[PDB]
Design a protein around this motif. Structure first.
Motif: not given
Lengths: 360, 213, 232
Positions: C203-232
């Motif tokens: 929902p559009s009115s909810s944006l800027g209030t909650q948070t969203y982060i994606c967690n790439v569990n790329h196992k063979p590279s032992n890597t987990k990078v999380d980036k934050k999404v914010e409307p800007k």
């Protein structure tokens, strides 16, 4: 008149008991595993338990054999129905082969002495027509009973077996030359090499030619059984003429190879494919012929002769289907030429009689 | 040896009749089986030796030999019969499968929604500034996008991948990603993506401009 | 139907071309002494394809022509299993190798129609991955703008760029958002590094209030990078 009518029911039960296992086996082929080699071994159990044990019947036959063998059948078939695992079913089919290879010489012998000197017509015609009636009515009866409590068909043929004891004990009453055996004992093997190799594959030869759903082929073969029965009831005229003892087999074999040759070139499912079922008539005048021949070589002790039949006809009926299934894949028409080949081999072997008749 | 199998997509509504046919390159025997594979699980066997139902299989899956045209016929489809169907030739010890038949559910029509996203601020460090024109909640499959920048068509610089049909709303979803470098990005200002679909009555084409104005 | 036959497999994973895997299809619950074993495979996306076989007793190791000679299949009846070699690996061998068993016969009954049987048993499969230029994924967020598509509805997501090899698992707020997630299947990019984006509808009115982060569990590279999404 009544002893013989009681007696037919034993043979009817034996071959109806062979025929009743087909519509129930897939129910617990998946309940036990039962790979391909195991099922082939289950088949061969009946074969090698009928093979050697059958002449022993003729060893003992000179009443008692029929009843002990029928108790053996009922016990065998019950223990088949119990169905723990392969260690039970294998030994059950072995003891069932014991029973069905002991009663068959007992019946095939004892008919040959109770019956009057017209022993052909009613006696042997119906003994080799009730065999086919049992083979037909095996699956037909098993269709209704397998729906409810799939173990029920089995001991059904079990329960009847106990009935077939009492009728066969209170409704009935009692009263060398290895060289001369050679002519039919090998002979009955040769056709059983190919005739079996024919019949076993008829449901695969006419599903790769003109398409046969399972009901149409069943209609074809029920018609074949009926119109072959209606020919082997009046069998006594045809055997009283045609130079009784041995000449008839040759003419039936020439007829069969002629109609097989006509069968190889038959398209058109209903017109010239269905109606060519009549081939099997030429293969149903020969089983009573060789059984009568066996009963006629041995003056007494007909049990040995019937047993020597029922062992090597089973040897042929076991060797043939393996060969036909193995070499079926290299062709589509391969089963037919086996039947043609063995029929001409039979023609070759029966015409040896003239040189044999020239000396004693 | 091959085993050509047609067709490769069925959009059949629930309870209707479907037919899938394989044509053996050589007439082998009555030895053909008809597997099915649910998405991400193991294939199961449905029909063996070209006519015989498997144990524990509904009676609808009626196969039929026809010359060399082995066929599988389902009288009615049900919500448990939406998965890929493979047909296997059991030749003389040289097995070969089929090209693969999919079976997919029908919806009526859904208008695709379009979105466009500016390049992230961390793309500019690596030069490649990938933008994406989104397509979400539509049915059916056939849709495509022709990008424009300063009103000029682009070809070969846009890769796109479909999802699978969502289990709830039963729609697809699409995305096309355009990749460039700062050598080609900085000479262009006005960006736009155009989408056309059957349910889309008229083309809808809106997007952003440089400067975040 | 009372059957419990289970075929299991183990031994997949990352390799280098020219490596040597050896895949154990550890059978169970059946008489291995007389049965078949068949090894099929499925490339990522495509349809099934048969690659090896063996008859446990009185049989010869039949093979597939396109991959003949790079495999040595053998069945050891001693420990109730069956194995398959893995040599001279090429990029066309990334797959998911099932281990399967089939039979088919005919139980004939005197010129009637008697039988057919299949016995069917399959396995589960091990992901076998081939040539590596192992690299962790780079995550960049696709920022949602201010456009008002339909009242309170908007879209956002994070782009997973330049990774190799499959797979990557993405999730939103670490399992707290699955109602309306889209993870488009990865496309084999021209440069050799796969890509796979993911977006959600919020929902559009909810944006800027909650948070969203994606967690790439790329196992063979032992890597987990999380980036934050914010409307800007």
């Amino acid at each position: 008149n009544k002893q013989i009518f009681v007696l037919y029911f034993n043979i009817f039960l034996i071959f109806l008991g062979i025929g009743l296992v087909i519509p129930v086996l897939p129910v617990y082929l998946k309940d036990l595993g039962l790979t391909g080699s195991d099922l082939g071994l289950l088949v061969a159990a009946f074969a090698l338990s009928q093979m050697i044990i059958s002449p022993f019947g003729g060893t003992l036959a000179d009443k008692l054999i029929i009843c002990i063998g029928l108790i053996l059948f009922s016990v065998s078939e019950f223990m088949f129905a119990v169905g723990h695992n392969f260690s039970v079913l294998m030994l059950s089919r072995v003891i069932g082969g014991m029973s069905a290879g002991m009663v068959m010489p007992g019946v095939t012998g004892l008919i040959a002495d109770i019956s009057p000197s017209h022993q052909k017509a009613k006696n042997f015609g119906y003994m080799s027509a009730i065999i086919n009636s049992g083979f037909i009515l095996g699956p037909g009866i098993g269709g209704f009973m397998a729906e409810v409590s799939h173990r029920m068909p089995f001991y059904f043929a079990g329960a009847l077996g106990i009935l077939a004891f009492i009728m066969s004990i209170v409704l009935i009453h009692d009263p060398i030359n290895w060289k001369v055996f050679i002519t039919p004992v090998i002979l009955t093997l040769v056709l059983s090499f190919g005739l079996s190799a024919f019949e076993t594959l008829y449901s695969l030869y006419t599903a790769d030619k003109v398409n046969y759903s399972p009901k149409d082929i069943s209609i074809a073969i029920t018609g074949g059984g009926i119109f072959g029965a209606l020919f082997q009831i009046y069998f006594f005229d045809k055997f009283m003429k045609y130079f009784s003892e041995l000449t008839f087999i040759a003419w039936s074999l020439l007829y069969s190879v002629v109609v097989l040759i006509l069968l190889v070139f038959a398209n058109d499912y209903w017109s010239i494919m269905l109606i060519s079922f009549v081939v099997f008539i030429g293969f149903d005048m020969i089983r009573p012929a060789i059984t009568n021949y066996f009963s006629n070589i041995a003056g007494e002790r007909q049990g040995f002769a019937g047993g020597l039949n029922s062992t090597f006809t089973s040897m042929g009926n076991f060797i043939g289907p393996l060969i036909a299934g193995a070499l079926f894949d290299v062709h589509i028409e391969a089963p037919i030429y086996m039947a043609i080949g063995v029929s001409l081999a039979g023609v070759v072997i029966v015409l040896i009689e003239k040189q044999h008749r020239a000396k004693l | 040896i091959q085993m050509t199998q047609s067709p490769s997509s069925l959009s059949a509504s629930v309870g209707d009749r479907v037919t899938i046919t394989c044509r053996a390159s050589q007439s082998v025997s009555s030895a053909v089986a008809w597997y099915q594979q649910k998405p991400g699980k193991a294939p199961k066997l449905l029909i063996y030796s070209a006519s015989s139902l498997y144990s524990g299989v509904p009676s609808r899956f009626s196969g039929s030999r026809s010359g060399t045209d082995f066929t599988l016929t389902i009288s009615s489809l049900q919500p448990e019969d939406f998965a890929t169907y493979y047909c296997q030739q059991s030749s003389s010890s040289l097995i070969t499968f089929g090209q693969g038949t999919k079976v997919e559910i029908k919806r009526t029509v859904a208008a695709p929604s379009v979105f466009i996203f500016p390049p992230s601020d961390s793309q500019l460090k690596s030069g490649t500034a990938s933008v994406v024109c989104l397509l979400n909640n539509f049915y059916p499959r056939e849709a495509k996008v022709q990008w424009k920048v300063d009103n000029a068509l682009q070809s070969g610089n846009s890769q796109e991948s479909v999802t699978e049909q969502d289990s709830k709303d039963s729609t697809y979803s699409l995305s096309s990603t355009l990749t460039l470098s700062k050598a080609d990005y900085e000479k262009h200002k006005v960006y736009a993506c155009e989408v056309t679909h059957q349910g889309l009555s008229s083309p809808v084409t809106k997007s952003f401009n440089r400067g975040e104005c | 139907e009372i059957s419990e036959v289970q075929l299991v497999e183990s031994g997949g994973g990352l390799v280098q071309p020219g490596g040597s895997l050896r895949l154990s299809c550890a059978a169970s619950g059946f008489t291995f002494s007389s049965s078949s074993i068949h090894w099929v495979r499925q490339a990522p996306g495509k349809g099934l394809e048969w690659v090896a076989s063996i008859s446990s007793s009185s049989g010869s190791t039949s093979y597939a022509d396109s991959v003949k000679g790079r495999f040595t299949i053998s069945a050891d009846t001693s420990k109730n299993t069956a194995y398959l070699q893995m040599n001279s690996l090429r990029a066309e061998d990334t797959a998911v190798y099932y281990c399967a068993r089939w039979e088919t016969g005919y139980y004939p009954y005197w010129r009637m129609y008697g039988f057919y049987w299949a016995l069917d048993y399959w396995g589960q499969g091990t992901l076998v991955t081939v040539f590596n230029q192992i690299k962790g994924p780079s995550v960049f967020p696709l920022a949602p703008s201010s456009k008002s598509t339909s009242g309170g509805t908007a879209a956002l997501g994070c782009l997973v760029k330049d990774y190799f090899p499959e797979p990557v698992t993405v999730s939103w707020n670490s399992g707290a958002l699955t109602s309306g997630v889209h993870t488009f299947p990865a496309v084999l990019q021209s440069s050799g590094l796969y890509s796979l984006s993911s977006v959600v509808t919020v929902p559009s009115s909810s944006l800027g209030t909650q948070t969203y982060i994606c967690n790439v569990n790329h196992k063979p590279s032992n890597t987990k990078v999380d980036k934050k999404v914010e409307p800007k």
